[PDB]
Each structure stands twice: as C-alpha cells, then as structure tokens.
C-alpha cells in the first residue's frame, strides 16, 4: 500500500486509551529490539502478534507516539527491504516467523528486526550485541547502566546529555568486548538517532521537557507498556537533538577487525558528512546483496519499496536505481 501521509491532527492526546489497552504476550506473539514498535504492538496500535505491513507500522508510530512522517517512512521501508517479505508486504518486529509468508531465495533472510547486521546492530542501550548471544531481549544489567547514566548525567531522568554519554559508553563497551563490533553506514546513523527517541517520544506530551523518568523508561524498554494516562508528544518529531549526542563524543565509523580493542576506521563508510552516501550504500550494497538477481515480481516489489524508501530520504540526495526504472 502507499506510505501513509502525516497526521491531520498532531496534538498531544491520551494514547493509553480504552481502545489501546496494554496486554501481555500470548504464545506466538513476537517482540524484538525496538521498544517503540514493541509498545505499539502490546497496545494494539500494531497487530499484537508483532507482524505488520509497512503502512500499519507508519500509521502506528505516528498515531501512538507522533513520530514524524519522513522518519517513519525512511526507517519502516529500510527495515522492510532488508528484513520484511516484499511479496506478502509483512515484517516481523522481532524473530523470523513463517507468518511473513513464503520466503524469497537466499541470500535474502527475511529474518525480522531480530536479524543482526541488516537494521539491528551493536552498542544498543538495553539489548546486547549479537556476538554475546541475544540482540533482542530486554537486558536488566544494561538497563541498570541506563539508570546509572540517568542518575549521573540527567539528575535521575534520561535526557540528551545522558544519551550522549551512554551512546559513547556502549560503543566503548563493544570495542572492549565484541571482536566482531561493527559501527559503519546504516548502524552508525540509526544508533545515534535511537538514543534521542526516549527523550523525544517516551516523555508524556503534556510535559515534552525531554526528561524521561525511570518508571516510564522501564515500562517502555522492558514491558512494552505505556504509562497509565500516557499522552503522546504534542507535535511530530523523531531524532531532533541527535546533534547534541554526536557533539558529546564525536566518533568515526569503523569496526573491530576480529579481535577486541582493534577499532579500525572504515574510509568507505558514510558518516554525518555524507548522508546521501549512507542511502546509496544501503540500496546499492545491502538491499542489492540480499536480492542480486530478483525474479520479475520481486524486482517490482523491490522498486516500489525503494521508491517509498526515497520519500523518507532528506531532500538534496539523488535516487539510485539498482534494478533500473
Ligand atoms: C518507524 C519505524 C521504526 C522501526 C522500523 C524501528 C526499528 C528499530 C530497530 C530494528 C531497532 C534496534 C536497533 C538496535 O538497537 O540494534 C530500534 C531501536 C530502537 N527504537 Fe525503533 N524503530 C522504529 C520506530 C521507533 C519509534 C517510534 C521509537 C520510539 C517511540 C523507537 C525507539 C527505539 C529505541 C529507543 C531503540 C533503541 C533500543 C536500545 O538501544 O536499547 N523506534 N528501532
Ligand atoms: C485534535 O485532537 C485533540 C486531542 O484528542 C482534540 O482535543 C482536538 O479537538 C482535535 N482537533 C480537531 C481539529 O479536531
Ligand atoms: C546482559 O548484559 C550483560 C553485560 O553486557 C551480560 O553480562 C549479560 O550476559 C547480558 N544478558 C543477560 C542474560 O543478563
Ligand atoms: C539533563 O539533565 C541534567 C541534570 O538535570 C542537566 O544538567 C542537563 O542540562 C540535561 N540535558 C538536557 C539536554 O536537558
Ligand atoms: C549506486 O549505483 C548508482 C547507479 O549505478 C550509481 O550512480 C551510484 O554512484 C552508486 N552509489 C554507490 C554509493 O555505490
Ligand atoms: C529519515 C532520515 C533520512 C536520513 C537519510 C539521508
Ligand atoms: C530517524 C532519523 C534518521 C536516523 C537515521 C539517519
Ligand atoms: Cl510528520
Ligand atoms: Mg542492537
């Protein structure tokens, strides 16, 4: 279906309402590495089993959290292209599931958001690196470090100052402990953006002060649960303030080279100075590597989702066509 348009009415409102009650997981219900999508599924803004169309996801993040249209479109079609079923139009917000329907040929994985190294990546705040055995479950130890960083840099609250320090700490942790640590291209970009989302979107919209309390933080991060009487943000936003997180500890993109403490800058990687290159590499390398020689119906689905992806890309970039026009 078409990418949904922006909200007609973007006002703060109760989103923990009678039609969107929190419910616990039933057997087969899928939750993954994204606390935003997890919460929308656990409140029935998405299907509660955690399998959704891109249009459902875009409508969910806008209606539930006032995620802005451009950011919703970019992230959703990126995730769908590398992790979703392009024929069925279904994406798992977590583990690989037969519920996304018959699989395309390898090397395409359709592994859901749990798929390491497509969208999901290292130095997550409350999820472990894939190397340590679990890239998707809430980690209490990592959350306790989030609380500690909030206590130290945020006076008990998670804010952009806390985001800047924790983002850097998680990178340094992965460099020290994950011999396979990768922090390039798409992950480099999204890892910074993600640290702003709690401050911008998990803060009750009646306050919108960028100060996330730890009761609200645990409710979202661990239980996929909006606070009682949660109001969504009062205006559309996504990553506003990412500049403060970067400026706190500017990092070059790079990877460990098969050993801990071997972080090596990748001059082939995009960085914040080459945003269009991040888009071009995502399409020409990541998507193309998953679908090198697509059949006619997969090629059509790819080109449609790649057009949709480009709608989410900031003006100034040229669209690239790996399967022609
Ligand atoms: C619009 C479509 C969205 C997609 C496709 C998406 C996808 C993802 C994925 C795959 C991750 C895991 C990346 C990683 O840490 O390895 C992630 C992380 C995250 N997402 Fe989402 N997301 C979306 C929207 C949102 C929204 C609306 C929010 C908040 C309201 C949000 C909050 C977060 C946060 C806080 C994390 C970081 C978790 C952590 O590092 O502990 N996302 N997102
Ligand atoms: C927008 O939504 C808010 C919150 O529900 C509501 O109070 C307001 O009346 C709505 N505005 C319009 C123009 O309907
Ligand atoms: C959570 O993260 C900590 C530190 O990274 C790690 O020791 C632990 O194994 C992870 N998983 C669980 C199951 O607590
Ligand atoms: C985070 O909170 C601390 C302590 O209240 C404060 O010094 C800092 O300015 C805050 N940062 C932001 C961006 O609100
Ligand atoms: C992507 O491929 C297009 C079309 O061939 C080309 O113009 C562009 O330079 C490529 N970009 C990258 C980053 O390889
Ligand atoms: C929606 C984010 C756009 C960034 C890519 C240039
Ligand atoms: C959601 C804002 C853009 C993050 C990736 C460039
Ligand atoms: Cl918007
Ligand atoms: Mg991760």
The span from the CA of 74 to the CA of 3, in Å, is 10
CB 70 within 8 A of CB 314: yes
Ion ligand 9 neighbours, Cβ < 5 Å: 120, 124, 127, 135
Q: Give, in degrees to the nearest 5, the angle at Cα 197 between 205 and 269.
A: 155
Q: 193 C-alpha to center of ligand 6: Å?
A: 10
34 assigned to a ligand binding site: yes
Q: Using CB atoms within 10 A of its CB, is residue 264 exposed (0-12), middle (13-18) or buried (19+)? A: exposed
Burial label for 14, CB within 10 Å (0-12, 13-18, 19+), is: middle
Ligand 1 nearest-atom number relative to CA 135? 16
- Calculate the alpha carbon distances from 206 to 9, 63, 197, 235 in Å: 16, 16, 17, 11
In the three-class reduction of DSSP (H, G, I as helix; E, B as strand; rest coil), residue 304 is classed as: helix
Which burial class, exposed, middle or buried, applies to 112 when counting CB atoms under 10 A from its CB (0-12, 13-18, 19+)?
A: buried
Contact 76, 26 (CB under 8 A): no
Q: What angle do CA 99, 70, 108 make, to 5 degrees?
A: 35
CA distances from 104 to 85, 117, 228, 272 (A): 8, 19, 42, 33
Ligand 1 pocket residues where CB is under 6 Å: 33-37, 57, 61, 65, 67, 72, 75-76, 79, 113, 119-121, 124-127, 194, 197-198, 201
Nearest to 185 by CA among 117, 281, 120: 281
Mutation pick for ligand 4 pocket among 146, 160, 161 (CB with most ligand atoms within 8 Å)? 161
Chain centre to alpha carbon of residue 176: 24
Whether the CB of 289 sits within 6 Å of ligand 2 = no
For residue 14, which of 242, 226, 263 has the smallest C-alpha distance? 226
51 beta partners? 92
**Ligand showing the shortest atom-to-Cα distance for residue 288:** 5
| In the chain, alpha helices (H) | 35-42, 54-65, 69-83, 140-153, 160-177, 185-201, 214-221, 242-248, 275-281, 288-290, 296-311
Contacts of 18 (CB under 8 A, 6+ apart): none
Q: How far, in Å, is the centroid of ligand 5 from the Cα of 285?
A: 9
- Nearest atom, ligand 6, residue 317 CA: 6
Asked if 242 and 196 touch (Cβ cutoff 8 Å), the reply is yes
The domains of the chain are located at: 13-312
Cβ atoms of 91 and 83 within 8 Å: the answer is yes
The residue whose CA is least distant from atom 1 of ligand 6 is: 71
Task: Please work out whether the CB of residue 318 comes within 6 Å of at least one atom of ligand 2.
Answer: no
Measured from the Cβ of residue 107, the count of other Cβ atoms closer than 10 Å reads 9
Q: What is the DSSP letter of 277?
A: H
Burial class for 296, CB neighbours closer than 10 Å (0-12, 13-18, 19+): exposed
Residues, Cβ < 5 Å to ion ligand 8: 6, 68-69, 236
| Residue that has been written with the tokens 């087969």 in this structure | 28
Identify the CA nearest to 272 among candidates 185, 200, 172, 181: 185
Residue nearest to atom 10 of ligand 2 (CA): 9
Question: Tokens in use for 178?
Answer: 């994950």
Residues 6+ apart with CB under 8 A from 200: 210, 233, 237, 238, 239, 240, 241
Pairing of strands 254-255, 182-183: antiparallel
Q: How many CA atoms lie within 13 A of 44 on its CB side?
A: 10
Q: Would you tell me which CATH number, out of the four given (1.10.489.10, 3.90.1010.10, 1.10.10.10, 3.30.1330.10), belongs to the domain 13-312?
A: 1.10.489.10
């Amino acid at each position: 279906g078409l990418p949904p348009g922006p909200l007609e009415n973007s006002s703060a409102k109760l989103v923990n309402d009678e039609a969107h009650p929190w419910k616990p997981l039933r057997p087969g219900d899928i939750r993954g590495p994204c606390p935003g999508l997890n919460t929308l599924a656990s409140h029935g803004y998405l299907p509660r089993n955690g399998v959704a169309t891109p249009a459902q996801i875009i409508n969910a993040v806008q209606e539930g959290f006032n995620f802005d249209n451009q950011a919703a479109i970019f992230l959703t079609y990126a995730a769908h292209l590398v992790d979703g079923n392009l024929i069925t139009d279904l994406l798992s917000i977590g583990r690989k599931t037969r519920l996304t329907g018959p699989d395309p040929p390898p090397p395409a994985s359709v592994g859901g958001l749990n798929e390491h190294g497509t969208f999901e990546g290292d130095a997550s705040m409350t999820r472990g690196d894939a190397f340590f055995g679990n890239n998707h479950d809430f980690n209490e130890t990592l959350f306790e470090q989030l609380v500690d960083y909030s206590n130290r840099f945020g006076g008990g609250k998670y804010n952009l100052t806390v985001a800047g320090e924790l983002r850097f700490k998680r990178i340094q942790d992965s460099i020290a402990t994950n011999p396979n640590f990768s922090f390039v291209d798409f992950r480099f970009f999204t890892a910074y953006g993600e640290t702003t989302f709690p401050a911008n979107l998990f803060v009750d919209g009646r306050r919108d002060d960028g100060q996330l309390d730890m009761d609200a933080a645990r409710s979202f991060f661990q239980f996929s649960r909006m606070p009682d009487d949660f109001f969504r943000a009062p205006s559309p936003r996504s990553g506003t303030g990412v500049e403060v997180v970067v400026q706190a500890h500017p990092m070059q993109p790079g990877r460990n080279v098969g050993k801990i403490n071997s972080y090596t800058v990748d001059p082939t990687s995009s960085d914040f100075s080459t945003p269009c290159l991040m888009y071009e590499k995502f399409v020409n390398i990541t998507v193309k590597s998953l679908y090198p020689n697509p059949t006619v119906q997969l090629r059509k689905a790819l080109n449609t989702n790649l057009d949709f992806l480009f709608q989410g890309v900031a003006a100034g970039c040229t669209q690239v066509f790996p399967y022609g026009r």
